[PDB]
């Protein structure tokens, strides 16, 4: 599936890092869109899609349907600039750039000269490749699989799982999870090329466990390091405890969560108090790609999420940690600038 906007069955606002996604439209100026573009909106100009900063694109026009003449376009993640192209009838689209590093392992005949730096079979070690991945990143490769079982399994009895394993064209791609909990996780992709068998093993880097959050846990030996700690086992029964993180930057590569030894109210981090004012987080932040992760250190309770990118509104939300009659408030304040 992918993005869609319908004008047969208002404003179609869209902006994101597009990983070979298909933007769907249903039916328009300037001229024929997806090859003509409303770049300078005020000067009302018509820049073609050829003279733009995107590396690889695919524009599609479908008339086979007997009810609508739909227009679609596929956007490769390869984009060295932040391109902004408009088209109304209003449908404005600004393609954002992927902030993460891209590791392309081209093991195919097609000379992929679009991205200069690339990795191939010489980097293998006895038909073995050990790739390290940072907190959030993207690994690409171009070959043909044996029985097409790749990049989901793991042999350390601990499967390395991703936010999205996208299989378009002949390119296998792995989207690194912003925070994976386990110490050892791996994934094997056994691909064949030139009658040789290549195994690509992926593992995460030593994750900087810098969780911009609060640790109310009564334990020292934690696999997770929060920027703020405390014990909740000591306070008054009627003492409200306030841990209020404030973040103010243009871009965001932050991990926000908490380790509560008691129960967590509401079901964070999906639900949060505004400040019974249970709102949904994704709508409150208004960002599509927000990853969610959870963990349990025995009886400790870890709940966190990962914000990556700009933020449209100065959002504030509050979660609660409750151990017996005692309480502990936490206020995240993500600024917009």
């Amino acid at each position, epitope marked *: 599936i992918g993005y869609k906007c319908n004008f047969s069955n208002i404003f179609c606002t869209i902006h994101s890092y597009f990983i070979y996604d298909k933007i769907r439209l249903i039916i328009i100026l300037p001229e024929k869109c997806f090859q003509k573009v409303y770049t300078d909106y005020e000067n009302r100009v018509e820049t073609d899609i050829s003279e733009l900063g995107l590396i690889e694109y695919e524009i599609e026009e479908n008339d086979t349907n007997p009810n609508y003449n739909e227009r679609t376009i596929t956007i490769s993640p390869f984009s060295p600039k932040d391109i902004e192209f408009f088209c109304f009838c209003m449908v404005h689209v600004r393609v954002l750039k992927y902030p993460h590093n891209i590791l392309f392992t081209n093991l195919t005949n097609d000379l992929f000269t679009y991205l200069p730096k690339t*990795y*191939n079979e*010489s*980097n293998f070690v*006895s038909n073995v490749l*050990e790739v390290e991945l940072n907190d959030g990143e993207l690994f690409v490769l171009a070959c043909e699989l044996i029985n097409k079982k790749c990049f989901q399994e793991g042999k350390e009895k601990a499967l390395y799982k991703s936010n999205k394993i996208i299989y378009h064209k002949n390119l296998t791609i792995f989207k690194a999870p912003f925070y994976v909990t386990s110490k050892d996780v791996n994934t094997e992709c056994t691909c064949k090329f030139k009658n040789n068998n290549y195994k690509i093993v992926l593992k995460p*880097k030593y994750e900087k466990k810098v969780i911009h959050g609060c640790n109310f846990s009564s334990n020292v030996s934690s696999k997770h390091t929060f920027t703020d700690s405390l014990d909740i086992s000591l306070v008054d029964d009627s003492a409200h405890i306030s841990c209020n993180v404030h973040l103010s930057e243009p871009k965001y590569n932050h991990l926000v969560g908490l380790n509560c030894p008691g129960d967590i109210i509401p079901d964070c981090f999906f639900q949060v108090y505004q400040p019974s004012n249970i709102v949904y987080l994704d709508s409150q932040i208004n960002i599509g790609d927000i990853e969610y992760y959870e963990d349990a250190e025995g009886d400790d309770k870890i709940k966190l999420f990962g914000i990556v990118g700009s933020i449209p509104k100065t959002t504030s939300f509050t979660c609660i940690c409750k151990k017996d009659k005692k309480s502990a408030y936490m206020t995240v304040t993500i600024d917009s600038a």
Partner: antibody, heavy 123, light 114 residues
Framework: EVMLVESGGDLVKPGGSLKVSCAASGFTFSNYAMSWVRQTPEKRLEWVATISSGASYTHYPDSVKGRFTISRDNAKNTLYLQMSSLRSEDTAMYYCGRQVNRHDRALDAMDYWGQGTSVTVSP | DIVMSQSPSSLAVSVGEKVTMSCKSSQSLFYSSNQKNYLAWYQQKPGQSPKLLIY???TRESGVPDRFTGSGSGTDFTLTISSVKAEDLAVYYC?????????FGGGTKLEIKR
């Protein structure tokens, strides 16, 4: 200048344990992977172990498998090596060498070698 | 494993000549596509740590004397000193890095005729 200063030389009874450090200085430590090699008193060189750029991968030979433990602290820019269940043959001069990363490969030559800190195993 | 047969174990030469370090591997060290060899020569000065000379069995390191011109492909590899000096009388080591584990050579001491 590149500078790999090792540390941690002393005598151990057969069966003991020891940790040897290697304070790397003067380069992007997390950019290049590390490794250890030992030179027997007979001046014979052996490959001890090698560690990944961010410590996700490690390799050991069949001789010291499970007995030694390589590790790196990219916060302080220092390499380590924890040896256990030591034998008399483990007496050698242990070198801390940085692998070449021009061409991105896990197995490469050692661009720069360290001073070397020797250990001994005797009762 | 790989065995690195390196001869001779002892060697005595005069000042200002050419000497041919010889080393042969048990298995080949030549990728088909890469078209390069995975052999490295090191200089272990007496009372000192070793240091790299030539990588890829031909390309030399920065700061390595141009007289050191290694050679060979596949199994046999030979290093040559165009003009021997009185500063590099060190045991040269022949190390492979073609597959795990990486093994070194026996060493070729450079005793000199004085």
């Amino acid at each position: 200048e590149v500078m790999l200063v090792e540390s941690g030389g002393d005598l151990v009874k057969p069966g003991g344990s020891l940790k040897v450090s290697c304070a790397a200085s003067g380069f992007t430590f997390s950019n290049y992977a590390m490794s250890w090699v030992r030179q027997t008193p007979e001046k014979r060189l052996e490959w001890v172990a090698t560690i990944s750029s961010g410590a996700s991968y490690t390799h050991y030979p069949d001789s010291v498998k499970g007995r030694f433990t390589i590790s790196r602290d990219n916060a302080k820019n220092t390499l380590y090596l924890q040896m256990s269940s030591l034998r008399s043959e483990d007496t050698a001069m242990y070198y801390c060498g940085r692998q070449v990363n021009r061409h991105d490969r896990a197995l490469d030559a050692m661009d720069y070698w360290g001073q070397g800190t020797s250990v001994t195993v005797s009762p | 494993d790989i065995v690195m047969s390196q001869s001779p174990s002892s060697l005595a030469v005069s000042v200002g000549e050419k000497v041919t370090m010889s080393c042969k591997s048990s298995q080949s060290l030549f990728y088909s596509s890469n078209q390069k060899n995975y052999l490295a020569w090191y200089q272990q000065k007496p009372g000192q740590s070793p240091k790299l000379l030539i990588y890829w069995a031909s390309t030399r390191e920065s700061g390595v004397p141009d007289r050191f011109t290694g050679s060979g492909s596949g199994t046999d590899f030979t290093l040559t000193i165009s003009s021997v000096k009185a500063e590099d009388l060190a045991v040269y080591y022949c190390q492979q890095y073609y597959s795990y584990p990486p093994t070194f050579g026996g060493g070729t001491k450079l005793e000199i005729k004085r």
